Every structure is written in C-alpha cells, then in structure tokens.
Design a protein around this nucleic acid. Structure first.
Ligand SMILES: [K+]
Ligand SMILES: [K+]
Ligand SMILES: [K+]
Ligand SMILES: [K+]
Ligand SMILES: [Mg+2]
Ligand SMILES: [Mg+2]
Ligand SMILES: [Mg+2]
Ligand SMILES: [Mg+2]
Ligand SMILES: [Mg+2]
Ligand SMILES: [Mg+2]
Ligand SMILES: [Mg+2]
Ligand SMILES: [Mg+2]
Ligand SMILES: [Mg+2]
Ligand SMILES: [Zn+2]
Lengths: 82, 150, 202, 44, 68, 220, 129, 98
RNA sequence: ACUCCGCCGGCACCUUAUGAGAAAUCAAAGUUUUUGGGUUCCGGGGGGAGUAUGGUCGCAAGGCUGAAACUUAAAGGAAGGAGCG
C-alpha cells in the first residue's frame, strides 16, 4: 500500500461491505450502495444521508434486508434521526 | 455413539447448576449415610439406592447432602461388593444368554450378541484390574461365571 | 383524541387487511411476523411495516432525479397502483411483463439504467430482481410472509396479494415521499383519494 | 381511455375507517404497539 | 430466528424453555419435586399416588400436589 | 463515430470520468469498449494468445468456427482477457480484442520484503481455478523474474508483474482454462483483506449520483 | 470422538466468519483455546469473547469483526526451534508481512514474532491471518 | 452415468425386498420396482350394460365391479404403454397424470 | 383415536449455492494450493491376469494369497441470458 517513504502504491481502496466487512471488487455487479436521507424537525429531506454498501455475497444470501434494518436501527440513534 | 451398534441417542440426565441441597431438604448428612448403609445391607446396589432416595426421600443428589458419592460411602463402611456393580450385570447377562443358547443352537442372533457382551466384559474387567478394583489374577470364565453372579 | 401519523396509517392498513399474511412464513420474514393464529395464518406486525415504509421513503427522496426510479408490478392487482405511484412521485412505472435484457442489454430499445427499483412481489417479479443483480441496482419490494428475500435490500412486510392492500401501501408510500419533499403538508391526510390506486376490473 | 379509471371515484371510499373487524391475535398485536385505543378496531 | 437477530449470551427465556435440556447455554433439568412426602415428577417407583411411565409419572386425580 | 448508449459512456464522452479507478471503486459494469480506449487507450497493448478451431457435426459435414484468445494490458496494473468464437479468423480476433478491453481489471501489486522502489510482485499468495486448472502465485523477491509457463507469463507481463513464483495443477494444455485461471487469480489480488485495508470505509457519491443533472438532460 | 478441542473451536469460528456471522459459540472450552483467542484478540482479529461457566467444561461466545480470513490448527503439533520458524511461516502464511503462527513454548502460548524476540522454541498450535 | 436418484426402485433403509411375478410375462421383479396399477371396472362392459339391465331378473340390482391389481415388469410396462419414456426433466415428476 | 405447538432419535424427500466437482451430480461427495480432527483398508496407462508358480483352506466345486516374460498409444470417465467448454 504505502512505500517505505509514504507514497501510496494502490490504484484505489475498494469499499468494504457495511454488514460483513468484505471487500467489494470491481466486477461485483450484485453489490449496491444505498443512501438513507436525513430529515429535519418538520420531517423534510435536508440534503444529508448515510451511505451503506452491500456486497453481492450478502445480498445473494437474502440477508441484506435484515442487515440493513440493524445497521439503520443503530445509525439513526447516533445522528439524531428517528 | 453406541459402543456395539449404530445408535446415536443422547438421552441422559442433566445435573442442575446448584450443587447445594434445596432449602426444603432438612435431612442431614449423617442421616443420609445411615440409610445408604441400611439399604446396602439389604442387597441393593449403588444405582438402585440413589433411585429410592430420589423417589421416596426427595434427595436428588447424595453428593449435595453428604459431599461424597454413594459408592465411596459404602467403601468407607466396607460394603462395596467385590465385583463392581456394572461388571456384575454384564456377567449376569452373559450367563443368561449362554443358558438360553444351550437349548437354542440355531439362534445365531443370540450367538452374535453373546460375543458382544463377553467382549464388553473383558474391556471393563481390564479397566478394573488397572485401577485395582479387582484382584490382579481375576479372570472371567464362562464355565464358572454362573457361580459368581446370582 | 387526535391520532398520530403512525396510528392513522396503521388504522388504514388494518382496514385493507395489510396485516394478513400467508399460511407459510419464510425464515427471513419471521422477524416481521408477530404471531400465528390457530387458522394457520401469520399476522404481520404493522408497527414494523410502517417503519420500513419510512425507511423506504428516505431512500426514495435521496434520489435526485425521480426518473431514475422504476416501479413495476407483474400481477394485475398492482398494475394500477404503480401507475398512480409514478404519477405523483415522478417515478417511471412499468406495468405488465418485464422484458428480459432491459437492465443488461445495452442495444435494445427498452434499455434502462435505474438507480432504484421498486417491486410489488419478489415471487412474481423474480425476473427484474434477478436481472437487477447484474447492474448494481438496489431494490425495494413489498414482501409477504412467504416471499423470498434474495437480492432484496429493503423488504416491506405487508400483504402484497389483495387489491386493497396493494393500493393502500403505494398510497401511503407516495404520500411519505411527497411529505419528505415538502411538496404537501404533513399529517396522515392527503388530498388524493386512495381509491384511485385500487384495481379497476373491466 | 383514462376516464374509465381515473375519473371513476365513488362518493364513499371502499376503505371504512370505522367498524374494523379484527381477530384476537390482531388485537394483541396492536396492544404491543400501545394502539389498543383505536376507534375502528373491534373484535369479531 | 436468524443468527444475527439473536444474542447467544442472552437468549429469550421462552426460547431456552423449548430447547433440549442438554442444548441450553447452561444444562438444566426439566424435572422437579412436589409434595402430596416428596415425589419426583419422573418417578420410576410406584408410590397409589403416582404410576411410573415413560416420562412424567401419572399422578392420581384424588390428591393434590404442590410443586416445590 | 461513437454515440454512447450507457450512462458511463456519456460521462466518459463528456469527460467527467477520467480514470478507470473511479469506475472500479463503485463496481460498475463497462459495456462499451470505447470507454476503455478513452481512459487507458494509448497505453494498452493487445496480443493474440491462440486460435482454436471448434467443430459442430452436421448432416452435410462439420461446421468449423474459430475461437480467438486475446489478452490486453498496459503493463502497469491493468489486464484484460477476451475470447470470441467466429466463422472468420479476422472477425474473431477483432471481437476478442473488444471483449478483452471490456473485462479489464485492476491488479494489485505488492513487495516481497522491504518496500523499496515500485511494487513488483503479488501482495499475497493467490490462487485461481478454471475447469481442472489451478494456478498459484507466491510473492517472489526482486529480480527472481516471472517463474511461470508461457501462457501465465504473457498475462503477468501485461499486468505489470515483474517477479513471482507460480505452480500449476490440472490440464494446463487446455489453454482456455489455463489463461482464464491465471486471469482468475489476478482479480483476486484486490479481494483479500489485508490489515492495511482494516481502515473504515469513507463512501463517496457514485458517478450516477454526482452527475445526475448531466445525465437527466437528453444528449443530442 | 473429540480429539482436538482446538480444531473444533477454530473450525467453528472459520465457518462462522465465512457465513458473515457476528457471534459464534465454542464448546467445549479449554485454557488452550482461551490463550489462542487472546493472541488473536491482541492483534485485532476478533472482538470481545465471553466465557460461560456451566460446571462441566464451559462455553465461549466470540464476537467476530470480519477481519479474520482463516484460522486453523496444525496437527500433529510438530516441534519448532527458533531456526525453523522461518520455514513454517513461508509455508502457512500469505506473505512475509502479516499473519501469525501460534506456538506453545515453555514461556507460554505466543505468536511466532514474539517467539523470535524471546528466542524460544516450542510446538505449533495453529495459525491465523 | 447414474440415471435416477432412486436407482429405478423404491428402497430405503432395508436390504432385501421379495419379488413379484409380472402379470404379463411372469418375470421376477422386486415389489418396490414393479409398476403397479389397480384397475376397477364394471364386470359388464358399457357396450352390454343396456342389454343386461333389460334382462335383469330383479327390480333392483347393482352390477358388481371387477377389481384387478396389475404388477408389470419394466419391459412389459413400456411395451404395453402403461408408462412411457419421459424427458430428463419430466422423469422427476412423481405425481400421477390427469 | 384425532387436532395444534415443540424436543430428541431414525428411513428419506423437496428447494437452493454463499460451497464442491471433469462434469453427471452432491446439503455432503461442503468447510482443500487460504492444502494438517482421529484411524483402518485400498489405487498408480491399457493388456498379459486374478493367469503361472509356491503356500494355505476345502470332500469337491473352488476360496484366500499372487507374479513375470511379453505386448500396446492409447484404454477409460463426463458431457443480451446460461455453461470451464
Ligand atoms: K437413555
Ligand atoms: K418403479
Ligand atoms: K424428525
Ligand atoms: K448469441
Ligand atoms: Mg453423539
Ligand atoms: Mg469400535
Ligand atoms: Mg445408459
Ligand atoms: Mg434402520
Ligand atoms: Mg442385497
Ligand atoms: Mg438438490
Ligand atoms: Mg491434503
Ligand atoms: Mg496398471
Ligand atoms: Mg452470447
Ligand atoms: Zn413382464
């Protein structure tokens, strides 16, 4: 990754699945990146969102729905959303 | 699974996490050991002594009340049988099969099971000799086995 | 007394039998089922159904261009709701049969590259769900108790069979999307009538 | 022919908010949500 | 329940209830004692207060038993 | 000329996207070979690996088709493999070159020991399988060279690998599975989660979300 | 019969990790398993694990964090002097930059990098990376 | 190449099954492999019910039925068209036809 | 006796791949070049050949054990979407 001097030696840093922590390769066309919008006191989209990336492995297993539900039940409690 | 079959059963007792006696159990350790000696003198074995205590006296585990297993209590009073209970029952079964087999020469199923029972006797007898629970020269003899048991 | 936005929707969903599930429950849908009655029918937890509707709406409003959203239904009962859902939310409705190669064959006229995909039943819309997994297309789907969850990112636990259930679900979802845009006033009411989403037999 | 469906809207909605018939299991499902005081919900 | 929708250390008290006595996080017997003179729920002996069976001993309708 | 039919084709045609790594980051399919010619076009270099005739029995005789294996790569971490069957040798080669470009992958490179100079070998032990053929790649010290047969060696050179140890098991004489198995382990170089990838992911907007307005407007 | 409780523990974790589970139960427990986990925990390959007392052998629930590629035993437990550690790493580990071989030495259970620092040999238990 | 998961018969958890004799040719065949059909039809064919019913000597009488259980070997079942060769996909369908 | 929920054990079946495989196919034939839970038997191109010989068992039929000379370039296995092809 980093040379002995410090320069980066990677073409890019692949994303990691938000549920399984697996790397998402360039040909994983079953992987999806999702955005959940943030609301205000009134309940109107404010232009802010939280991003979630899922690998094809977990989506093929059918566990994406439950994984997304748990990841959102925790994140919303941290950013004030509810 | 089973030693001498393909059975894979798991049924067994499940001891509770509480090793102490219940608050409703009032009998003391000296009283329990008095009954254990009383039953042993009547011919009962350690297995069927604990069953009576559980079913008729509310003593789930003797070790919880007395701190020692039933066989250890009997040995301390010189009431432990010369041949261990489990080995005794295997010999009794082998005697029964042989007695049945003498009148039924064509019962090849029994002849097969007799081999399994006697091989089970020799594996257990070997263990008891190593732990010195049997006389060093003790040996199982089909001819004289029926005199030992029963 | 006044009913909150959630109690009103749940009251509306009860009247449409949105909570009545199938006699079989998929193992990945058990988390949404509440209880099974002696009849053998599963009862969907409408409290969680409303929460997933909100989560789905948050994903929809985050799409800058609504034309990138595609909502479709294979069964006739939902062919009317999807058309009305796309009318008010600005999405692109595809009622009827899905043409294979729509999301993969770049040379056919019907080729599309949606950013989001909405479906009425994973079991009947298996083709677009299967084909969306070749183009990094996330999918939202209304899932019954016996629905397969393969390649479904957000599954809304509801009864996607009855004509009233399908119409109400899209009516509520369309309202939530608009309310989150500020286009309409908050609350459980909407000037549009729900009956415009129900199936109109010949 | 859009009027055949669009303009066709009866004076009374097919979804009656009042007099909602529910089962014993459904009532217990609403109790868990704290919504056992809904007006329409009534046992069969 | 899915593996990730459950906590192995704090399972619901109803789930452990229906699990096999040996497969619970901590083994626990399903038997118990009761008054009527204590009697084991799965007694193998004839007390006629209880009749041994393949499982719990069949109690008599007449007398009333209190679990302890 | 080129009239893009995909969103990526338009952005690359417009110039918003200027690197393949921006596409790889979001795992987007590339369906137009003109995209590859616009980003790493001048640095690419194709090479026909083999021409393989295949035959189908028919009532009149045997229909012979030609199967061309083509490998492309800039020698700096990008390699592609394409196979096409066609009735003419020239037609198969031209289509195989197109397929090779469409499958170009990023190849991660690492250091055997000390991180001195540019990366020269694979970062970890990686294996690829196709049919019965398994190709293994072990990191090698600088100057060791590519210790591999001709088919893997050609692919590794186009990927920019300088020094690696290789071993094979199975029917390597099946060139199709040999080259594909080699290409299979090269794409796994970015799948293995090393400790240096443990840092939490910082997501960025996809090209379709960043340039929605440009994509919303029809192109004429 | 159960021959190597360590193999069952590491095999269970490896299968659970590949399936993307967050937790996994190991039964039976042993002080060798606990010390093997601690080596993995110190290098940030597992999260928090908890030992449950059941009055028989105990059980362990291990929290997984998705960083563990593979973990396995080496059976039989060959002797490894300090001079032969280099050969074992060249065989079992992905590269010369990450991955640990766990040894049981007279100084305790430790990874091969710590064994070189203390210049102590022993026997191979397993590996992980 | 293994053609069927059941090996062409219906035997699980047992060693030996006694054979039956084909109703057509008498070939020995294991009972679990033989094609069995239970035929129930009127003892009088439909082409003669009217004549026999007109000649009945009783005001009321139900014509009995003919119960016959037929057990065929594989060769006779195929030759007699009791069963037909099916495609690889259709071989797995075990439900009786319409 | 029947109905509903569940636990342990058994003969199986159905769907599916995140797995494996040359594939057929397999919920084990999976957890294998990211190769190591324990243990027994057993194979090393096709023939000659389960033959000759020696030994051993059997009343016999034969069983068990079991070669070489020589010969040969095959014998053999599976057979835009989908398949390693
Ligand atoms: K038992
Ligand atoms: K048959
Ligand atoms: K069962
Ligand atoms: K074609
Ligand atoms: Mg067992
Ligand atoms: Mg044995
Ligand atoms: Mg054949
Ligand atoms: Mg059986
Ligand atoms: Mg047989
Ligand atoms: Mg199957
Ligand atoms: Mg091996
Ligand atoms: Mg040979
Ligand atoms: Mg094609
Ligand atoms: Zn016949």
């Amino acid at each position: 990754m980093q040379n002995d001097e410090g320069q980066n030696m990677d073409l890019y840093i692949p994303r990691k699945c938000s549920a399984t922590n697996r790397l998402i390769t360039s040909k994983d066309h079953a992987s999806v990146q999702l955005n959940v919008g943030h609301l205000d006191e009134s309940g109107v989209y404010t232009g802010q969102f939280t991003t979630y990336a899922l690998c094809g492995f977990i989506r093929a297993q059918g566990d994406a729905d439950s994984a997304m539900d748990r990841l959102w039940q925790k994140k919303k409690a941290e950013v004030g959303q509810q | 699974g089973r030693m001498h079959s393909r059975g894979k059963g798991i049924s067994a007792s499940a001891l509770p996490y509480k090793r102490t006696p219940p608050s409703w159990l009032k009998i003391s350790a000296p009283d329990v050991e008095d009954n254990i000696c009383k039953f042993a003198k009547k011919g009962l074995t350690p297995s069927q002594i604990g069953v009576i205590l559980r079913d008729s006296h509310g003593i789930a585990q003797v070790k919880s009340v007395t701190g020692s297993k039933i066989l250890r209590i009997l040995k301390a009073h010189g009431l432990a049988p010369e041949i261990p209970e489990d080995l005794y029952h295997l010999i009794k079964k082998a005697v029964a099969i042989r007695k049945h087999l003498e009148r039924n020469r064509k019962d090849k199923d029994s002849k097969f099971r007799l081999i399994l029972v006697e091989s089970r006797i020799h594996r257990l007898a070997r263990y008891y000799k190593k732990t010195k629970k049997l006389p060093p020269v003790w040996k199982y003899e089909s001819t004289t086995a029926s005199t030992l048991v029963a | 007394r006044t009913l909150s936005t959630k109690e009103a929707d749940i009251q509306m969903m009860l009247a449409a039998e949105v909570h009545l599930g199938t006699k079989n429950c998929d193992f990945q849908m058990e988390r949404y089922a509440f209880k099974r009655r002696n009849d053998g029918i599963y009862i969907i937890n409408l409290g969680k159904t409303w929460e997933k509707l909100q989560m789905a709406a948050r994903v929809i409003v985050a799409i800058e261009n609504p034309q990138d959203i595609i909502v479709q239904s294979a069964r006739p009962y939902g062919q009317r709701a999807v058309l009305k859902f796309a009318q008010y939310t600005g999405a692109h409705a595809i009622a009827g049969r899905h043409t294979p190669g729509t999301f993969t064959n770049q040379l056919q006229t019907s080729y599309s590259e949606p950013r989001l995909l909405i479906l009425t039943d994973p079991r009947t819309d298996h083709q677009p769900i299967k084909e969306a997994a070749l183009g990094n297309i996330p999918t939202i789907a209304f899932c019954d108790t016996d629905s397969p969850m393969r390649y479904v990112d957000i599954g809304i636990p509801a009864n996607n069979k009855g004509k009233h259930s399908i119409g109400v679900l899209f009516w509520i979802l369309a309202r939530m999307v608009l309310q989150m845009r500020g286009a309409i006033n908050q609350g459980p009411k909407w000037d549009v009538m729900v009956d415009l989403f129900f199936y109109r037999e010949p | 022919e859009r009027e055949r469906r669009m303009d066709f809207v009866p004076e009374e909605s097919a979804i009656k908010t009042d007099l909602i018939e529910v089962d014993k299991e459904t009532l217990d499902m609403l109790s868990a949500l704290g919504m056992s005081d809904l007006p329409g919900v009534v046992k069969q | 329940v899915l593996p990730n929708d459950v906590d192995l250390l704090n399972p619901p008290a109803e789930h452990e209830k229906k699990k096999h006595k040996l497969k619970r996080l901590v083994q626990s017997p399903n038997s118990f004692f009761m008054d009527v003179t204590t009697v084991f729920s799965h007694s193998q002996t004839v007390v006629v207060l209880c009749q041994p069976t393949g499982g719990r001993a069949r109690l008599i309708e007449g007398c009333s038993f209190r679990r302890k | 000329k080129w009239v893009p039919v995909t969103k990526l084709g338009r952005l690359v045609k417009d110039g918003k996207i200027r690197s393949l790594e921006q596409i790889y980051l979001h795992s987007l399919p590339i369906k137009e070979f003109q995209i590859i010619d616009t980003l790493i076009g001048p640095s690419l270099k194709d090479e026909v690996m083999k021409i393989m005739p295949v035959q189908k029995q028919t009532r009149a005789g045997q229909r012979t088709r030609f199967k061309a294996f083509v490998v492309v790569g800039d020698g700096n971490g990008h390699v592609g493999l394409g196979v096409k069957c066609s009735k003419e040798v020239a037609t198969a080669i031209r289509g195989g070159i197109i397929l090779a470009k469409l499958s170009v992958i990023p190849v991660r490179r690492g250091y055997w020991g000390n991180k001195i100079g540019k990366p020269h070998t694979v970062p970890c032990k990686v294996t690829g399988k196709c049919g019965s053929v398994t190709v293994r790649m072990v990191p090698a010290p600088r100057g060791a060279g590519i210790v591999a047969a001709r088919v893997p060696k050609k692919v590794l050179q186009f990927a920019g690998i300088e020094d690696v140890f290789t071993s094979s098991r199975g029917s390597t004489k099946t060139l199709g599975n040999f080259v594909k198995a080699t290409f299979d382990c090269l794409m796994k170089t970015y799948g293995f989660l090393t400790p240096d990838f443990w840092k939490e992911t910082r997501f960025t907007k996809s090209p379709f979300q960043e340039y929605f307005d440009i994509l919303a407007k029809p192109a004429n | 019969v159960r021959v190597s409780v360590l193999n069952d523990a590491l095999k269970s974790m490896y299968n659970a990790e590949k399936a993307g589970k967050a937790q996994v139960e190991l039964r039976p427990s042993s002080k060798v398993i606990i010390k093997f986990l601690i080596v993995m925990q110190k290098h940030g390959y597992i999260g928090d694990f908890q030992y449950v007392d059941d009055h028989r052998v105990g059980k362990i629930v291990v929290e997984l964090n998705g960083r563990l590629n593979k973990c396995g035993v080496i059976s039989p437990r060959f002797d490894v002097g300090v001079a032969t550690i280099e050969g074992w790493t060249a065989r079992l580990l992905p590269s010369r930059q990450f991955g640990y071989i766990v040894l049981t030495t007279s100084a305790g259970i430790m990874d091969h990098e710590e064994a070189r620092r203390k210049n102590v040999g022993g026997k191979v238990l397993g590996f992980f990376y | 190449t293994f053609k069927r998961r059941n090996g062409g018969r219906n035997k699980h958890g047992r060693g030996h099954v006694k054979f039956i004799r084909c109703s057509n040719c008498g070939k020995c065949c294991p009972k679990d492999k033989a094609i069995k059909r239970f035929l129930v039809r009127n003892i009088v064919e439909q082409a003669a019910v009217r004549d026999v019913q007109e000649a009945c000597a009783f005001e009321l009488y139900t014509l009995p039925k003919l119960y016959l259980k037929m057990q065929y070997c594989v060769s006779c079942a195929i030759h007699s068209k009791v069963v037909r060769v099916r495609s690889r996909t259709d071989r797995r369908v075990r439900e009786p036809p319409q």
